[PDB]
């Protein structure tokens, strides 16, 4: 019997402000934690075509430019779609597809990335309240999900392979130069000048 250490009974009358939720999970407060790959990005901001076109960057490094192009075209985005009835709706370019085997896949455009799920126990999601210095739980993270390219022939995989293969090809640090005179000339001339000023300084100090 490990007796309870705390028996003072002191209690805090702290009241927390909570906001209504736009959605509510049904049947289970379960969520899946998914690691974000390098070739996939999330753009929570609404898609603004004009700033996007005006902010496209061009670099000399072909590998970096190709990687940026791949991540930009593969980035998950969303934008406001004007309905034919005059209303406004949230429109996204990303979907989740479940196959007949029960596996799940993340889809952006025509690209499909498979999901590998590993069950994790005693893993939960919490909401941080920094102003009060306490953590409020949200739900349970039952499964950890990894995103994997569907096949070799997928354009994303081929672009990644090209970028990584040509990235390690460029390696040349030392820069060549042409020597026109003796590399030791500076040292000897500066030593001569230093000895001259040594003699002058010694004479001055003996005369001082």
């Amino acid at each position: 019997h490990t007796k309870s250490v705390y028996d003072n009974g002191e209690t805090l009358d702290i009241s927390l402000p909570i906001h209504p939720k736009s959605h509510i999970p049904q049947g289970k407060q379960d969520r899946w934690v998914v690691k974000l790959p390098d070739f996939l990005d999330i753009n929570a901001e609404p898609f603004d075509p004009r700033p996007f076109e005006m902010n496209v960057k061009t670099h000399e490094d072909k590998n970096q430019e190709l990687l940026d192009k791949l991540i930009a075209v593969n980035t998950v985005r969303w934008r406001y779609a004007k309905s034919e009835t005059g209303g406004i709706f949230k429109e996204t370019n990303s979907q989740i597809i479940q196959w007949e085997d029960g596996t799940y896949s993340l889809r952006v455009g025509s690209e499909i990335f498979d999901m590998f799920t590993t069950n994790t126990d005693d893993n939960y999601l919490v909401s941080e309240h920094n102003e009060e210095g306490i953590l409020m739980t949200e739900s349970t993270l039952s499964k950890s999900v990894k995103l994997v390219p569907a096949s070799f022939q997928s354009t994303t995989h081929q672009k990644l392979a090209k970028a990584l293969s040509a990235k390690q090809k460029k390696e040349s640090y030392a820069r060549s130069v042409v020597t026109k005179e003796d590399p030791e000339e500076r040292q000897r001339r500066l030593e001569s000048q230093e000895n001259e000023r040594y003699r002058l300084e010694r004479r001055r100090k003996q005369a001082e």
């Binding site: 130069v177 590399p183 030791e184 500076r186 040292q187």
Partner: protein
């Protein structure tokens, strides 16, 4: 602060920094170098 000279590194023959990497076949004879020589060694003293 600029290019200060720190030393001289011996150069392996027929390597990328050797003078014989270029020069083709004809000039290799004018320099009194055997075209059958394969390099891969240093010349110290």
């Amino acid at each position: 602060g600029n290019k200060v000279h720190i030393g001289k590194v011996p150069i392996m023959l027929r390597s990328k920094f050797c003078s014989l990497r270029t020069l083709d076949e004809v000039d290799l004879y004018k320099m009194k170098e055997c075209p059958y020589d394969m390099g891969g060694y240093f010349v110290i003293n």
